[PDB]
RNA sequence: UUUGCUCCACACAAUAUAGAUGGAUACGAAUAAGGCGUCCUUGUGGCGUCGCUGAACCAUAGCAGGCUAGCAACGGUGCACUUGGCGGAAAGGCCUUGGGUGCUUGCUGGCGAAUUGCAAUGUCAUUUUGCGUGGGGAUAAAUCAUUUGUAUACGACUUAGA
RNA sequence: GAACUGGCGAUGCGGGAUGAACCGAACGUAGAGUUAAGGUGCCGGAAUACACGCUCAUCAGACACCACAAAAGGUGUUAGU
């Protein structure tokens, strides 16, 4: 067809902080159509890839992932708390992120 | 969910709209708000006015050149507003603020699309009925905005063009709809309706 | 020629108004309005759809344009008996309001093969009314 | 070893006889029926990659014949079951993606 | 918080020369059993000479209301004290119990002359039998001969940021 | 100033990305009111219907979407042209005529896919520049130095000089 | 200038924007969970939550320490005797 989207769109809003103090190892993250933690409980443990280009290819490619997973839900509105192997650079605060479906339990 | 949001920001109130487009900008969302001569201020027009003499008189006293400048646009006043709830001074604020640009009346890259409202801050819906409220563009030309007029000469001749395209849009949908109603009841049509469409 | 006045005519809350609970625990009911306490909440019951009695501020339903007639403050058997008599039940399912629920629910019912066959079906019937918008 | 035995069938989407992870697929409710079908030949040693040697790179550059007929008897009996129920063969043969304003937590499969 | 109504029995403590006190009762709107053993005590050390120490409590029992979907008028005598002396206030309410009735008059008198849960006493509470013993007219309004009103100005509140059309507030 | 400059097509490199991954889908006004349809005596008109959110509408099947056969219609859509308009607020876009060409999943068939080995973004976007081709297009000024004095601390300014 | 206690001095951490003493809590290096005091429009992590009222200020008001306001008045408005 037109779209092979196999996943579901984010954005990567902040870390975890204080009103002063922020704690790189736990990012936030805004899932599209989510509202409220008792939907967002459906997100739970899937993967999380951030999906970057640079200029100069390593292994064939120009085009670098890190990859994390969804821990736990953040505030009443959706928001949920996830962690990576390496934490996200913190200039990607808005910036898209991708969140597969698996390990599905459906 | 969209690339570009378009705002009509007429009946909006500028702190209620500051809010949320400012949280928009900082999730990435870009977004540009056109009419904003007409956007709403509760209270009186003249406790309005006095609130900005009060902010008029506010400069840096060995010179005035390096105070704070006192912007008489209402575009540039909503952008005041906004630029307050950024933090405008670092990096992430700047890139946030050059996903906006706010204009008065509606321009030619924004008048044929589609434009939509904010409606936890619509002036109908968040204030009470009685209660006094101030036309931004009023507030404006008065404290010094210059091109008051012009922006309504242009805004009614972009208005009789877009109701000469919505009497074709109109009669062209009512075409739509007659032709989908006749060819409705057939056993597509039955199978689609068991089927919720 | 005549006086002329827009009327402006909304929804009156009164005895036998028939409403429906927009949030809580019934959620989605039809109830009507027994009496009238203050300003801002009333005694409804609904107890066709399993509503229990109860007192309610007026800001969790949604008042219907339907209206059966109940003296105030009558009890549940003779709102079961008014409700039956009236049968405002169908009534309420011929309205285009019913009928949108039931769309919004079949769709959230639907799996991903039914999903496929509104696709095609769909296409077909864009085929059948595209080729009739080429004639008028 | 945990894993899901799959095939396309081969004649509709091209997926060949295959093993899977549980926990990469979703379990959509359509259901067709895979009795008469002889899957007890596979197992996990019908699948041997056959490791290769740490000298032999491939600078710049087949099939099992056992494999292909195993694939030809098993997906002819698994269309005769598909024939049954309409549009199956299309439905296997399309693939399956999100669109704008699909939201898996609210999708029943 | 939610209030519940309470009968609270009490007594002095046995002597040998008066065995059996005289057991006296009083009902209490309090949240739980505690704050209304509590108030209880309190309302007694104003009363009689006794206090906790030198007695007991015999029984406590929750009374709910008899009939919670009858629709009545209370009338309502408290005390409170403002912030330069002590006011003795009736004002009535329509509400469909009393639990729920001196709720709404704790939120009343917290709004309208900022007294607190400290400051009011609750006199009594009755409900009145007939109509024309009602004395304030903003609950005698709600008790003409067919009472109907409409809802002007419908605000719906939306769940999405952006709405793709003009609101109306017709109800 | 030893063949330089600009534009067009693709050919290869480099360069990055404040962050595509079906579609930014166009009345205006009011909110103690409206929208749409229809009728008439065309109005601050009559009658009917709708809202109670976009949970919409459009689009959406095919090797990341192939190679072929037929049926039914004379539709739908893409590309390069082509005719006629309209648009100056930041127009740089919108509509339309005609023919060509490709696809059509509206309907029914035939062949292909494996081995990326049980997942690894599994690579499909646009931004700038350079160097090659081969096809057009055009053949300047400014500054220093000299001079002026309507100018001037010096710079700067105003003049003149084939 | 004294009395009893707790502190700062000698002490970082979360909150009070800011501050020696206030509130919370005292400190090896890390991980996970839960909270205190304080907060949840945006800056800013977290409900433009729910519920009942009151107030419209041509100097509104917005939180202890704490960064001020009184006597006297007002058919402004609300509730009472």
Redesign the pocket.
């Known amino acids: 067809?037109?779209?092979?989207?196999?996943?579901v769109?984010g954005k990567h809003?902040?870390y975890?902080?204080?009103?002063?103090?922020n704690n790189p190892?736990?990012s936030?993250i805004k899932i599209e159509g989510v509202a409220t933690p008792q939907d967002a409980q459906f997100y739970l443990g899937k993967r999380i890839?951030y999906?970057?280009?640079?200029?100069?290819?390593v292994?064939?490619?120009?085009?670098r992932?890190m990859?994390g997973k969804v821990?736990?839900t953040?505030?009443?509105?959706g928001?949920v708390?996830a962690?990576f192997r390496n934490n996200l650079?913190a200039?990607?605060?808005?910036?898209?992120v991708?969140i597969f479906l698996?390990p599905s339990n459906i | 969910?969209?690339?570009?949001?378009?705002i009509?920001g007429?009946?909006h109130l500028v702190?209620?709209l500051?809010?949320?487009v400012?949280?928009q900008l900082?999730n990435?969302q870009?977004i540009?708000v056109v009419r904003a001569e007409?956007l709403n201020i509760?209270?009186?027009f003249?406790?309005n006015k006095?609130k900005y003499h009060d902010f008029l008189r506010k400069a840096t006293a060995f010179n005035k050149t390096r105070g704070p400048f006192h912007f008489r646009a209402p575009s540039r006043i909503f952008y005041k507003a906004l630029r307050?709830?950024?933090?405008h001074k670092?990096?992430?604020?700047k890139?946030?603020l050059?996903?906006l640009?706010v204009?008065?009346?509606?321009?030619?890259?924004?008048?044929?699309?589609?434009?939509v409202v904010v409606?936890?801050?619509?002036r109908?819906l968040r204030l009470?009925?009685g209660?006094?409220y101030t036309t931004l563009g009023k507030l404006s030309t008065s404290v010094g905005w210059k091109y008051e007029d012009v922006?309504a000469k242009?805004?009614a001749?972009?208005?009789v063009?877009?109701?000469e395209?919505?009497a074709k849009?109109?009669?062209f949908?009512?075409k739509v709809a007659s032709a989908?109603a006749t060819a409705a009841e057939s056993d597509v049509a039955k199978q689609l309706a068991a089927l919720g469409? | 020629t005549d006086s002329?006045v827009?009327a402006?005519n909304?929804r009156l809350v009164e005895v036998g108004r028939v409403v429906?609970i927009?949030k809580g625990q019934s959620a989605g009911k039809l109830a009507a309005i027994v009496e009238i306490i203050?300003?801002?909440?009333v005694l409804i019951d609904g107890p066709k759809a399993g509503v229990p009695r109860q007192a309610i501020?007026?800001?969790?339903v949604?008042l219907?344009?339907l209206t059966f007639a109940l003296p105030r403050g009558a009890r549940t058997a003779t709102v079961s008996k008014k409700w039956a008599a009236a049968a405002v039940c169908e009534k309420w399912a011929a309205?285009?309001?019913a009928?949108?629920?039931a769309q919004?629910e079949r769709?959230?019912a639907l799996t991903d093969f039914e999903?496929?066959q509104?696709?095609?079906l769909?296409?077909?019937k864009?085929?059948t009314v595209?080729?009739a918008?080429?004639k008028a | 070893?945990?894993?899901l035995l799959v095939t396309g069938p081969?004649?509709?989407?091209?997926?060949?006889?295959?093993?899977?992870?549980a926990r990469?697929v979703i379990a959509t409710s359509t259901k067709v029926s895979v009795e008469g079908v002889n899957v007890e030949k596979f197992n996990?040693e019908y699948?041997?990659?056959?490791k290769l040697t740490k000298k032999e790179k491939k600078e710049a550059n087949?099939?099992?014949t056992e494999?292909?007929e195993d694939?030809?008897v098993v997906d002819k009996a698994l269309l005769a079951e598909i024939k049954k129920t309409p549009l199956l063969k299309?439905y296997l043969?399309?693939?399956f993606?999100?669109?704008?304003?699909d939201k898996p937590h609210?999708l029943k499969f | 918080a939610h209030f519940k109504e309470y009968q609270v029995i009490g007594r002095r403590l046995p002597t040998e020369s008066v065995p059996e006190p005289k057991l006296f009762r009083m009902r209490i709107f309090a949240s739980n059993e505690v704050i209304a053993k509590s108030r209880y005590w309190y309302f007694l050390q104003k009363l009689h000479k006794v206090k906790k120490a030198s007695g007991e409590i015999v029984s406590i029992n929750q009374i709910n209301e008899a009939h919670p979907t009858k629709v009545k008028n209370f009338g309502v005598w408290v005390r409170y004290d403002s912030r330069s002396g002590t006011?003795?206030?009736?004002?009535?309410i329509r509400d469909v119990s009393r639990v729920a009735a001196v709720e709404?008059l704790y939120?009343?008198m917290?709004?309208?002359?900022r007294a607190r849960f400290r400051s009011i006493h609750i006199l009594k509470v009755a409900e009145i039998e007939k109509t024309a013993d009602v004395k304030?007219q903003?609950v005698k309004q709600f008790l003409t001969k067919d009472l109907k009103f409409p809802l002007?100005?419908?605000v719906?509140?939306?769940?999405?940021t952006?709405?793709?059309?003009?609101?109306?507030?017709?109800?």
């Open positions: 067809a037109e779209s092979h989207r196999l996943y769109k809003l902040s975890q902080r204080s009103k002063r103090v190892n736990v936030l890839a999906v970057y280009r640079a200029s100069k290819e292994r064939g490619s120009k085009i992932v990859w821990t736990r953040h505030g009443n509105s928001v708390r962690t650079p200039k990607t605060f808005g910036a898209s991708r698996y | 969910v969209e690339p570009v949001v378009v009509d007429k009946g702190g209620r500051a809010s949320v400012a949280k900082l990435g870009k540009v007409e509760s209270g009186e003249f406790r006095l307050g709830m950024v933090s670092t990096a992430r604020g890139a946030a050059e996903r640009k204009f008065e009346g509606i321009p030619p890259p924004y008048d044929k699309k589609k434009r409606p936890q801050a619509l109908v009470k009925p209660r006094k922006v242009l805004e001749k972009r208005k063009s877009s109701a395209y919505y849009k109109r009669a949908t009512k989908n469409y | 002329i827009k402006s909304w429906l927009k203050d300003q801002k909440k501020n007026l800001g969790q949604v219907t344009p309205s285009s309001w009928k949108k629920i919004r769709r959230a999903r496929f509104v696709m095609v769909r296409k077909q864009r085929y595209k080729k918008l080429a | 070893d945990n894993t081969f004649k509709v989407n091209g997926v060949p006889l295959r093993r899977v992870n990469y996990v699948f041997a990659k056959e087949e099939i099992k494999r292909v694939q030809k299309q043969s399309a693939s993606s999100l669109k704008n304003g609210l | 006011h003795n206030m009736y004002k009535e709404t939120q009343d917290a709004a309208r002359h304030r903003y002007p100005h419908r719906q509140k939306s769940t999405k952006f709405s793709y059309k003009r609101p109306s507030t017709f109800y």
